[PDB]
């Protein structure tokens, strides 16, 4: 969908997370669509990850990192992925995580950290906090800052990347991750 102004507005938003929520499927168009009464309105949730083809049945009280992607006037908000196990262990890992700013021949790098507050964590939620942090502490989405690649480590030979040039990853936002597995994140920003 691509742009610099927007990517600074969506990832600065108010995130939310929920649990004990069980529901029963209905397909809006393609394959799915859901809803839940949070205590103040009535939301919606779009399942369409590779993990959804295993869950066209419904939700048994899972954890849903419900951050809004778009909204209806009644306060209900559409969202994609973000679901996790529940009972979700309240583990708290302090993960390595680097950040190198490219400026052609220049590089302002910094070693840092990320706090994973769970046992299993949704790549949506993983990506939302991985960018929320860059936006507020590494000059992301403000000027020449908008292109780059997040290399999550997971084992000696694996990595899950996320272009920063666009948030077009609706379908893997279903993918889920083992907290203790992640060896160390490493970002590189090209301005």
């Amino acid at each position: 969908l691509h742009d610099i102004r927007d990517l600074h507005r969506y990832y600065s938003s108010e995130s939310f997370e929920y649990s004990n929520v069980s529901g029963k499927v209905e397909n809006y168009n393609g394959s799915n669509v859901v809803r839940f009464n949070p205590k103040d309105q009535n939301h919606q949730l779009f399942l369409l990850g590779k993990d959804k083809e295993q869950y066209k049945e419904g939700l048994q009280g899972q954890n849903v990192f419900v951050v809004q992607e778009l909204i209806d006037p009644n306060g209900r908000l559409s969202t994609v992925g973000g679901v996790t196990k529940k009972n979700n262990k309240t583990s708290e890992t302090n993960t390595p995580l680097f950040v190198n700013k490219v400026n052609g021949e220049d590089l302002d790098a910094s070693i840092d950290s990320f706090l994973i507050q769970k046992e299993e964590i949704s790549l949506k939620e993983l990506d939302f906090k991985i960018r929320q942090q860059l936006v507020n502490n590494y000059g992301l989405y403000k000027g020449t800052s908008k292109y780059g690649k997040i290399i999550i480590n997971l084992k000696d030979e694996n990595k899950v990347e996320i272009d920063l040039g666009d948030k077009l990853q609706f379908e893997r936002m279903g993918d889920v991750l083992n907290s203790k597995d992640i060896r160390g994140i490493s970002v590189t920003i090209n301005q």
């Binding site: 052609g104 220049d106 302002d108 790098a109 910094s110 840092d112 706090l115």
Partner: protein
Amino acid sequence: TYVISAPKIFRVGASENIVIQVYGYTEAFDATISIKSYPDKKFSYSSGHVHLSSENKFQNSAILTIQPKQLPGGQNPVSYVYLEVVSKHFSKSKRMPITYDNGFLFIHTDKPVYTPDQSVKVRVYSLNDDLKPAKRETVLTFIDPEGSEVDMVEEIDHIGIISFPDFKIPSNPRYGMWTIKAKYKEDFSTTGTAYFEVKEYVLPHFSVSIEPEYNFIGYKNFKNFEITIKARYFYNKVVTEADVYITFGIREDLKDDQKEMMQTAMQNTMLINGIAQVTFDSETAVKELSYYSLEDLNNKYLYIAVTVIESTGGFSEEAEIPGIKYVLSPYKLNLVATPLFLKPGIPYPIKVQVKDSLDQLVGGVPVTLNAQTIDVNQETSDLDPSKSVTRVDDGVASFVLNLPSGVTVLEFNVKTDAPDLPEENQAREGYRAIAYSSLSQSYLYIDWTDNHKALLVGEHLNIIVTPKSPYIDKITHYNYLILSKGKIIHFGTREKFSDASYQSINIPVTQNMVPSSRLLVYYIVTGEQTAELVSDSVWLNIEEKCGNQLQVHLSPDADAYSPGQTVSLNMATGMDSWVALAAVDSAVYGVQRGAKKPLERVFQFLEKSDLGCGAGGGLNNANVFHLAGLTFLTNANADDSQENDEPCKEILLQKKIEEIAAKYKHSVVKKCCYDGACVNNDETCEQRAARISLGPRCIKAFTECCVVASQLRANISLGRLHMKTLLPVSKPEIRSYFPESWLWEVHLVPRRKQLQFALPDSLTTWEIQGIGISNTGICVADTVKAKVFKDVFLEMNIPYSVVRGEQIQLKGTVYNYRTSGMQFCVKMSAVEGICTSESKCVRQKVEGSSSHLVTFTVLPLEIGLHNINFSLETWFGKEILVKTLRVVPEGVKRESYSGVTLDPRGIYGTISRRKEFPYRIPLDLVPKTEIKRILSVKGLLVGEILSAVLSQEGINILTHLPKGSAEAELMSVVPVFYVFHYLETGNHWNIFHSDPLIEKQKLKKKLKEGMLSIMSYRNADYSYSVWKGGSASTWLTAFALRVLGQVNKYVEQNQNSICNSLLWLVENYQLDNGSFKENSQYQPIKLQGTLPVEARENSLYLTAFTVIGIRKAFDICPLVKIDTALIKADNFLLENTLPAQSTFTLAISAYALSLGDKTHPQFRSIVSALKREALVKGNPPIYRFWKDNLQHKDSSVPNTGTARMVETTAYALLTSLNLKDINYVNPVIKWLSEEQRYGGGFYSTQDTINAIEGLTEYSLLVKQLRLSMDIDVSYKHKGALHNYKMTDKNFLGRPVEVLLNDDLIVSTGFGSGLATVHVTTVVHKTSTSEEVCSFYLKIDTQDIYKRIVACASYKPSREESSSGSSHAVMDISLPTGISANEEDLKALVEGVDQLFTDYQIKDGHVILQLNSIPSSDFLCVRFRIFELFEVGFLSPATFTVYEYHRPDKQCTMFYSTSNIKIQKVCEGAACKCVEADCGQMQEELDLTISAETRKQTACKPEIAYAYKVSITSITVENVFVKYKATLLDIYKTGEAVAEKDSEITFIKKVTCTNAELVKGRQYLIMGKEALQIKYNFSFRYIYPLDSLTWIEYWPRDTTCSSCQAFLANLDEFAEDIFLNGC
């Protein structure tokens, strides 16, 4: 080339940051690092596969991390490891030291000063190397002010706010500087430390203030310093005459409990009208008086402390100023981010920075800068001096000198040129700078500017890289490197601008840099010969921005609150966080809360993990990297770090006696002379010297200095004379209390949380602080003071107790705190049994921000009766305060000997299903006073001892016995220990209907807090000692061991202590026969015998006793050396008992062996001896016990038990109980479990522990017996009182006060088990004449104001030695409202001449304790007493003196504190009430001794006037109403309307047969003001005419029935009042 940076040290559990970055060509290439162990590259704890490339500019990072491996204690493990890196192109590693310090321990005691018995709140904030929660298990260990441990405890770390258990300050603690240390349970050397000070609270008599000329001393004054002290009572009325004693002293600091006082510290400038002053010539007052001869030599403290003793009452009040810094120069220079190394060709900068003696910045000071230099050519240069001036906004005075390339070392001095500062006191500093030596001729210089003292996070640092010099410019890239909190966090590379020299590097300041950081910047220079790394570096101080902004707020943000207001408090954070509230009485800190900082307190500390040092920049690329905090890994330059490592530190007439200290040769002799002269006129010098024990070494020091000061008092000097030489003896007293803290809860605040509550009813400024910790780190928030307070309020001072028909004066003061004054009107509520002046709204005026005395006279006839409502009225307030009045009778004996053992099943020798306790009224009973008596029925022989520990909280003594001894502190742990022992060792925990596991926690506790209680009496050598600071007693050491050994079963006691405590007796105090000598003079028992016999006996008694102790406790320190001793000891006893001298002696001897080998033939002999000695009641034995004597069978067992009786028989019972002698013992315990009194062991202490142990240990040895009686308590003639089914469910039922006047009858059904009935009956008698006097007494009140002189002599019992008593106490009841002279008594016990060893004023009783009361003659205490209030027909208190361990020796005597006669008649009380309170007309004529009584009866604040007048109207006619008189002259203006000449009436009704004013005569009048009935259609005021009005004839007779000598004084008094004012 490659560069691989990393810290100078590693840390275990530490995520060690290691950048790698390199100049390799295009070919990307892998890079793995890891941690490997000294010379064998075998162990590799961790590593990292971090692959650089031209994409990552060939730079990367890894979190290695050395966890726990080598754990062997002793092996010097871990010392040194190997850093390693790996690639395709090279491999390299390093030997570099490491450490066990990981993280930070932060000890948050709630407040920093405590008083005996407060409970220290505590928690610990703990972080790791990464300033994150750091969960771990931690362990602290409180350390008394003498540096022995005293406790310990670990706890689990759920979040980072470890919450420990409160630490109760001892009843009578070791006063002074406490220390709490804390260490990580597991591995990690990291240390926390904290402190608190335990000071001894004392009640203040009157506010003494002390204010110093200024807050520092500076050259200006130093020949003088106007110290003004100002004394005043709480009743808004300044002290008048007073005696002032100010003593000074130097001081290193304000964490120094000690400070070298100084002789010739001015005495007496007698306070006078609320002020005195003296200036203090510091020059004089230090020179010969210390190492301090130049003021120069002195930038430490001056200590001031006054003692203001009130002249009238004779009270006393102390006050101090901790310190007052001395100052040479009122500014202080310190360089500011100006590195001490010169790069050459670059001009060297030198920003100095001036500050005042208060550490604020001060601008506009001129500052000269002389500097000095030598060439590399070894030539010097004496620079020309420059001067600049200190900026205004900056505080900085910036220089720059341009340095000849060939410069090397520059040396600079820097000073202020204050034009009005004299040269001396100008402020100066010196520094030295040295050149970055580099043979490439190459150097580097980086700087940056920003106009403010702190880089705000979010800002962007433009920093100027000037490579100047390097023979060449072939620079490829500049590379930087930024550390913070011991860790590299950023690193990078800017391409060098091919053309020009310098460019800028722009680093964002990041939140990771937050407390500070350093950066270092290097280019790699290819000299033709060898590759040169080169770099400089700079320390970057940045803003104390938090990670989690926690901010607390009060709901009503108002700056003052109501004492009770409900009010919501709010938490705040930008990220979910842990909080941690606390609400301290802000007053602790208070007095100049030194600026320093609040949240910087932590930041300062928490960033000494900054490994680096200096303002920046090294000396070699090494050094540069070194001071950075780094050592690096780069083959080219020597990454070296010259040996060891850089302990860096802050580069980034009484004087005539006082000369006779000339006999110093030990401290104790100082004290010897010092308190030697003190002030003792009731006995000779050598009478006092006699009582001296400490050592004939100081006896001279005593008699010498004493005579010196005795003849002197004849020469320095009404009859007021009182020598002195102050020295608080270095005791931390503290005349102000500080309330327990609150809101000490943790909380989980996700960005918000609000938690209402109403704050405590109390005048306190609650500073409510609140730190928080979360994944960002630690962030203390800006405090939030919340003073509560009520505008105007009254307090009434009720006494402890008053006797029936004593007329009492009930004072109080009413508090105005409003800025303006106002009108009140306090009225007291007539409660049924209390007489009063109303059949009233006496509205007064309170001056603003002050207080008006109030008073009432009352007089109760109904005993015990309580309750009096008090009220006051103000325009906008009407408030009611309730109070309750203890009323009593006269001379109190309680006779308890009644009891039964309910035995329905005859187990014990017969069937007990009834005992009748009847009325027996002793013909000495005080009229109209009922006979109280209590009934305490319980199952189990061990049931009193159970009810006592599980019905009252907090450990408690089991008698009325006074707390002075260490012995009383020990005896407190006892009843819990035995209870817990019987509870646990016979599993009975199922007694509890409740949760037993937690009822058990409680007792472990009670047991511990009580165990520490004793520590104050633990000496330094591990020897305990009878009273505090008293010479080690061999005796109490044993007994302490005994009780310690005992409690070790269930609460482990410190082994090492117990060893040395044990090793003390045996190595020093066991004679070459195996017997034990007592050290101190403490006589514990008085034994019978001849002077020789006694010593023999006495010896057994100790040796037996001290065995039982070592024996009792031996098990925690079985120690070859002390097993021998135990035997050599045991030996003596076998070899030295058996021609038995006393049954008592025998019995201990017996019980003591009993605890060893109980088959030595000889032992069996002794047990024979003993067993033969016993006696029995009824045939067969139903009761057995032993008598103290030995076969001398006077047989006076006069229907009465005895401390020693119960003692010895417990020793038999205990011996027997050992030899499972089961049957023998039954009738023995039948008689104990029917001896012990309601609650616990009645007779004294020492038996009671044994008898308890017995009772327990036997109920343990013999099986229990399921209780199931059906008791019935009932009045013989009156209807049935209660009657209840007893069972193992409840047996420790309620007591019951038997009300009615009838014979009582306990009377169980058939059933089963064993229930102990005791019935402890109290009565008051009018006389002692009956009783048996074991002490000769005398007492009376002397005038030479007034003072008590009590004496005693010990009457020896037949067979007894002439030496005099055993440890004994005298106990003086004080008459109602007659305070004793605390200081006088302190005088007696507190000196080497100590007459007593322990005083205390509890509940209206002065209570003295000493080791003996010689029969040779009398022994006299004397002390003075001040009529606290007006009592009117007071009944006498009592002067009783018994022997501590044998209370059977109670000589008791009534006495009175006044001779005042005067008659009445009075029937059943309706007499002293028909006379409300009404006034008194002093007798006609008057006796000499009155110019003092006449004045005083004036300004005494209850005197709202004093004015002479004459009756112009007392209507002779009958039925006509009250007085009215014409005023003649006003001495004290009544607070009411009318002025000199006017008439003012006087009102009173009802029969008052006690004063008749004669019309036409001029009576002088004195009392409170007149009562305003303000208005309900217009009128007046006038007065009461009460019991302290001095209505008194003014016989202006000038010649009548020959008058006189009474007019000389009223004419005297007269022209005396107005002038002396008041």
